[PDB]
Structures are given as structure tokens and as C-alpha cells.
Amino acid sequence: PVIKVRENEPFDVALRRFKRSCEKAGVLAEVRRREFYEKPTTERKRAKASAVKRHAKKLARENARRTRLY
Amino acid sequence: RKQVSDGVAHIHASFNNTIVTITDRQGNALGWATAGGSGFRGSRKSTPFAAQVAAERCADAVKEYGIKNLEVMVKGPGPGRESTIRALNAAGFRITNITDVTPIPHXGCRPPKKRRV
Amino acid sequence: PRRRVIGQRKILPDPKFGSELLAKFVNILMVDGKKSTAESIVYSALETLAQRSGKSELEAFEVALENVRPTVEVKSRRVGGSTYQVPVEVRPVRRNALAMRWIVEAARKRGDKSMALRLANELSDAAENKGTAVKKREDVHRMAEANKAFAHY
RNA sequence: GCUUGAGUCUCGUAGAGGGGGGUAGAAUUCCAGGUGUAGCGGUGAAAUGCGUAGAGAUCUGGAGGAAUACCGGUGGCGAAGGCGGCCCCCUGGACGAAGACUGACGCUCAGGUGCGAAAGCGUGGGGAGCAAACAGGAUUAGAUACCCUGGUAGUCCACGCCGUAAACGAUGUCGACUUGGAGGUUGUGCCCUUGAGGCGUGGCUUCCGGAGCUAACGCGUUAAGUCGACCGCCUGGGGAGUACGGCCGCAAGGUUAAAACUCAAAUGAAUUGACGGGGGCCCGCACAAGCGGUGGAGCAUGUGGUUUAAUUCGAUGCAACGCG
RNA sequence: CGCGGGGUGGAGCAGCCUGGUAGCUCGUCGGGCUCAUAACCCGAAGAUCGUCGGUUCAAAUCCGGCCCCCGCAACCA
RNA sequence: AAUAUGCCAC
Ligand SMILES: [Mg+2]
Ligand SMILES: [Mg+2]
Ligand SMILES: [Mg+2]
Ligand SMILES: [Mg+2]
Ligand SMILES: [Mg+2]
Ligand SMILES: [Mg+2]
Ligand SMILES: [Mg+2]
Ligand SMILES: [Mg+2]
Ligand SMILES: [Mg+2]
Ligand SMILES: [Mg+2]
Ligand SMILES: [Mg+2]
Ligand SMILES: [Mg+2]
Ligand SMILES: [Mg+2]
Ligand SMILES: [Mg+2]
Ligand SMILES: [Mg+2]
Ligand SMILES: [Mg+2]
Ligand SMILES: [Mg+2]
Ligand SMILES: [Mg+2]
Ligand SMILES: [Mg+2]
Ligand SMILES: [Mg+2]
Ligand SMILES: [Mg+2]
Ligand SMILES: [Mg+2]
Ligand SMILES: [Mg+2]
């Protein structure tokens, strides 16, 4: 997440580009993940749960595409 | 007393406090300021405004070295990553490099057990 | 309420000067619905302050109000364990209402004789930042400055 | 005798499969030093704790241990437990294509033997981080807990022992048959690789669902469908997986496994409410914003209580008490 | 039996060693929040100091005994 | 952030 302010690059846009570079690297997500230790059982359980909810959401999405509401 | 012109600003923003340190390009610290030393205790010590105040105070404390431009290296996940750099540029140093140096172990040790509040 | 209020109630400008600001002042000073007494007291205070100073009654009243008007106050927010004294900027109508209310509180708590005398003296002190009203505004701004860390919300 | 079960060989394939050895970078910690000042660290707040003996921060150089970010994937392998940096040596299994070979050599399995997470035990090492025990601070009526600051065993290695887990897809192993769809992964064939395309065929794996089954929930070609072979296991709840006795163990304990009494239930799945310090969307002077009260004073009035011969009876959470 | 202490609201403790006056916590009472209780919040009262007798202008205090309660010692033969 | 309890047939 290292940036270089270039020629004729104002401070605000340099900071914005730095923000987006940090998010692209995802650093804060990893730090908030590593703040505590979560057991391998918890890791596996929550990974499975996230995958299950993603699958359910996408099936509900492209099923309700074939549904009229009003 | 010594003139350095080109400095490096390490921001260390944890979830509870922001430490801003201006050094030369050798790691020799020239000054520092902290959100807790800027008159903030507890609930307010870890807010972007507190980080802004601390960065401003550090900038003013490092004035006689005649620092013109700063590299910037940011560490930690705290709120003091944003307002601190804003306050540095508002103070007036030419910010030429902004880097995130947050420690990310490539595994590493075992983190503390998870809280149950 | 959970819906929304209609437009504010129409207020008839006071007869002597035709200022709805002074009408609101009279209403705020009024007690037990005795508007005649409130208007007489306000008018006596206004003429007395105009004579002691030199300014027109209306402009002198505006100066006294402006020296008391706040700009940011503190409201309570809940997160946990403690409360946030979040500083919020005030709208001008609330500014004038608060200034009038603080002036009237200070005037009532003053220790003179006739309430017209109390109000004239309090407004005169506000004309150079001395009254309990300007003290209250001082307290409000310094409390908001102390809590400024919570402003981002 | 036969080959279609079972197995061997030939060629390749994909993989955190296993054992041994080496190494890599990131990071925490510690040690030495340089710059550098009064805070740091922590919390819902706080304090214990660290710091002017110069902490925290930042830089340089070492030391050592543990785990391998990204790749990373209801992805892969393994009989299960489980296995994830990179490299090398030894090594097991699966799978595909074509052919040849052996010719029922098969399936299951009481007793037996082996493997078997974590914790734990023995000996010898190791010890960065984390952390039972422990101590202090806080919270609280208490708080021998959650939270905070430290911290030992232990997590790590070699060998030996334990042999238990919600050891779980709560679903024994093997075989055959019975509509589909969308994927994922790994081979293999055809053509046109004519744009990584389609067209098949194998293996494993994920979700939905059909007939059927099921008490229902649900399962549904990876069956809980239709059958066959063998084994294990159950017979109301509690007592009790306990006691006694065998066997195993160094111990913790594991395994096998009752009884007397006692109850008329215990239980599973769904249904309607109610409730939640569960979620979403709302509303009400519910809060918020204001104004004015009560609670203090004297009096009026009602009530409770005392009192009296009687202080008539009734109302007494909101929704009784200037009430009948 | 000797020696050192102790007797203070309902309970536990201070105060007292420097004679001019008795406090803390819990508890009790009254009200408040609650549907009600506990916790909690706000107010109040409570002991004239073991006891007798002295000293002193004044004794919880100083003194002498007396009463009860602890502690140490009660030995050598 | 703290937020314990509720035995009188129906
Ligand atoms: Mg922590
Ligand atoms: Mg057996
Ligand atoms: Mg172990
Ligand atoms: Mg032990
Ligand atoms: Mg050991
Ligand atoms: Mg050892
Ligand atoms: Mg250690
Ligand atoms: Mg403790
Ligand atoms: Mg701890
Ligand atoms: Mg078992
Ligand atoms: Mg398992
Ligand atoms: Mg499982
Ligand atoms: Mg089972
Ligand atoms: Mg078998
Ligand atoms: Mg498999
Ligand atoms: Mg299904
Ligand atoms: Mg069944
Ligand atoms: Mg047993
Ligand atoms: Mg036995
Ligand atoms: Mg209100
Ligand atoms: Mg009363
Ligand atoms: Mg009253
Ligand atoms: Mg009556």
C-alpha cells in the first residue's frame, strides 16, 4: 500500500488514491481479523456459513427475478 | 538545531491512541505528539479529531528543524489514519509519500484469545 | 412527534415597533397569559435601555440578543456506559429563542426591583458581555468546545 | 471349465496423503546502541501495570521459538482422527485410456490386532506468543466469572503411555436397480484449436428437486427409494453408564456392566399463541424540545394505621384513595 | 494464681496515650424507583462509654478497687 | 456499562 504523490497531484486526491490503495490491499480487514484468535472450528464454521448465505442469496435473487410484486 | 529539510512522519494509529513522530530519513526522532497528551482521556482519546490535534501539535513542535517535505508512513487500523494526514498537509508540510506499514504477519505468533463482552 | 409539524404559528408583530422578534420576546417573558403586563414591562425596559445607551430600541435589542446568541449546543447521544455530548450547530430560529430565554431567565433571577428595571439592566450588561445570559452562552460554547471530538457525527 | 466380479502388468494424471532432513520471508518478544521527549497501555468508563533510573515511538544489529498472510476455493488428498510456505530423499492410495494376463482368487466379520483430535501422564530437551492455575485492578449486594494488567503448567520437539470427543453427513460395510437440473474438481475421445467451442465418456464432490419413503421435519442415483449378504446396536424415564467384580493403565481413568427403589411418564416433529436484554417496519405528550406543577409549608378531602362502645359497609397495582 | 491488655449505639470497630465533645460501617426507621421483593436512591433517630468510689471547677478519658472477656506465665526438683 | 428473584389449584 505504498503510494508516491506525483507531479501536479494535489493533497486531497493523493490521500484519496492512498485510501483506495489501502482498501485494495485490504489491510484493515486483515488487522481486524487478527486482533483476536478465532479457533479453527470457528473459522471453518463461519466460512461455511458465509458460503451458504451467498448461495441462498443468489438463488433467491435469480428466482425472484421471475416474480411480480405489485 | 540541525537542519534536515526532508523528513519522514510515522503515524501509529491504534484503536485507542495515535502517536505521530517526525524523524529525519535516518529514523532519528525530532519530535512527537500523542492524542492522550493533547488533552483527551478515554472516550475521546481515539477520535479523528484527536489525531488531527496531535498531528498539528507535533508539526508545531518540530518547526525549528525547517522541515519542508515529508514522507508519510501509516501504521495501525485506528481512526487516526485520515485526519492525521489531513492535519499534516494543513499544517503545511509537502506530503510526498504516503505508505501503509501495518504489520501483517505471514502466518506468525498466536493472537490473544477472543473477548466475550 | 413521529410525523411532522405544519408551518409555525403566525405571530402578530407588536404594535409599538412591528417586530415579530420583539413579539416573540414578549411571549417568552409572558407569565400566566398576561400579555398586557409583559408588553408594558418589555416596552419600559426598551425605552430605558435606549435612553441609557443612545441606540434605537430595536437595534439595541438586536445587539443585546446577538451578544447572547449561541452557535453550537450539545445534545445527548447513547452508545453505552457513558453518554455523548455531541455538539450540533443551531438553526437561527432556535438561536433567537434560546437567546431570549436565557436573557429572561437572567433577568428574573436578578435582584433589582421592577422587572422592567431588571430586564433593562440585564440587556445593558449583555450589550457589553457581562450578564448571566452571556455567561450561559460562554458555558454552552466552552462545553461544545470540550466535546468537539464528537462533532463528526 | 468361462468371464462380466476380484486382482496384476504396461502409459500417464492430479493432490495440505505419510515419515525424514534443510531452508525462506513477514511478524510478535527480548538484548545492545542511536534520536527523542512525557506520557504509554487499557476500558463502556476506570484502575492495576510500564515510564524522568528515561518508557512509548523510530532506526540499526543480533538471539530464539512458534506458525506459514496472499494463493484459498459447501477446492484436494486421506479409512477415520486429520493434513495446508518452499526444496530434497524414502513412501502409501486413488484415477483415466488401450491391451494382455489370472480365472470367483469374492462380500461381511464375533473374539483379536493396528491406527485414533484435544486434554492428560513419564523421561530428556525447548519456551517467542498464547494461556488453565494464580495474583492484582475493576464490575457487583456478593463476583473465588465475564472485562483489564501480568502470569506457571501446557501448547513445541524425541520416545513411551493413555484410547476418549457433538470421534457427526448424529446416517455400519459391500453389491444391484430406479425421472432430472445447475455447478465444482480431475482425467480421456471426436471433430473445428475453425474465438480457451461444442459433442461424449470415466472418477470424486456441492446445492435444488421428481416418484417413492418418513410421525413430520426431511432424504431424494453420494437415498432416509426398491432389494440382497454380514455385522453392531435398542426395548419407558430416573437411579446409571453408576455401584460391585474382572481386564487394561504409572495415574487420571477407560472398558464390560447390574440392582434395589421411584414416577406415570420421559421423548421426537410440527401447530396456535405468548415471550426475547432477537431482527425489520411503524404509532401514541412515550421519549426528546418547552411551559407549568406535585414531593417541602398551612389548610381541605379521601385512604391506611392506631383509637374507641361505635369510629357502618364497599372500592385498595396502572384500571382503589375530592372513589360508591 | 501473677503479668499485659478489653469492656463505647442493635453487631463490628475507632476515639481515649496529650482530662472541656463520642464518631465509621452494617443494621433500624420514613419516603422513593418496582406489579412486588432484593439491590439501589434520598432523609432521620439511636450509645451519655462494664461497674463502685474518688480526683478535678469538669471524668468515657486520670486513679483506686470490684465484675466479666482474652493473651503470656504458673518453673528446678 | 450494570438489569437477581416471584409456590396462593387453576
Ligand atoms: Mg485486549
Ligand atoms: Mg471387534
Ligand atoms: Mg496433546
Ligand atoms: Mg498434572
Ligand atoms: Mg509433558
Ligand atoms: Mg518437561
Ligand atoms: Mg516462557
Ligand atoms: Mg482476581
Ligand atoms: Mg486474562
Ligand atoms: Mg463414545
Ligand atoms: Mg470430526
Ligand atoms: Mg462435520
Ligand atoms: Mg454415534
Ligand atoms: Mg471389512
Ligand atoms: Mg474423497
Ligand atoms: Mg434434496
Ligand atoms: Mg427413517
Ligand atoms: Mg465406569
Ligand atoms: Mg470397576
Ligand atoms: Mg420530556
Ligand atoms: Mg408529607
Ligand atoms: Mg405538599
Ligand atoms: Mg372505611
Nucleotides of D under 7 A from a protein CB: 25-28, 34-46, 56-60, 65-70, 73-75, 128-132, 146-148, 207, 282-292
Point out the residue among B40, B43, B48 whose CB comes nearest to the CB of C152. B48
- Cross-chain residue pair A36–B96, CB shorter than 8 Å: no
Please name the nucleotide lying closest to B34, CA to C1'.
D39
Distance in Å, residue B81 CA to nucleotide D145 C1': 37
CA of B64 to the centre of ligand 19 (A): 84
The distance (Å) linking the CA of B109 with the C1' of D66 is 7
Helices (H), C2-152: 20-29, 35-53, 57-66, 92-109, 115-126, 132-147
Report how far residue C134's alpha carbon sits from residue C142's, in angstroms, rounded to the nearest whole number.
Answer: 12
C71 contacts C141 by C-beta, under 8 angstroms: yes
How far, in Å, CA of B49 to CA of C150, rounded? 8
* Interface contact A2-B85, CB threshold 8 A: no
Tell me which chains share at least 3 CB pairs under 8 Å with chain B: A, C
Inter-chain touch A5–B97, beta carbons under 8 Å: yes
- Residue B18 to residue B15: CA distance in whole angstroms: 8
Closest residue by Cα to residue B99 from B67, B59, B71, B76: B71
**C90 CA from centroid of ligand 14 (Å):** 83
Q: For residues B96 and B44, what is the distance between their CA atoms, to the nearest angstrom?
A: 30
B 32-71: CB within 7 Å of strand D: 32, 34-37, 41-43, 45-46
Residue with the three cell numbers 461544545? C144
Phi, psi of B101 (to 5 degrees): -120, 30
First to last CA, chain A: 48
3-state DSSP assignment of residue B102: coil
Q: Do B47 and C152 touch (CB under 8 A)?
A: yes
Q: Which of residues 73-92 of B touch strand D (CB under 7 A)?
A: 73, 75
Considering only CA atoms, which of C63, C90, C83, C85 is closest in space to residue C75?
Answer: C85
Q: How many CB atoms lie within 10 A of CB A60?
A: 11
Distance, CA of C41 to C1' of D308, in Å: 61
The grid coordinates listed for A63 are 428466482
Compute and round to an integer the Cα radius of gyration of chain C.
17
Give the technique used to solve this structure: cryo-EM
A61 class by beta-carbon count within 10 Å (0-12 exposed, 13-18 middle, 19+ buried):
exposed
Interacting residues of B48 by C-beta distance below 8 A, sequence separation 6+: B79, B80, B82, B83, B84, C152
C15 CB below 7 A from strand F atoms: no
CA distance C119 to C110: 9
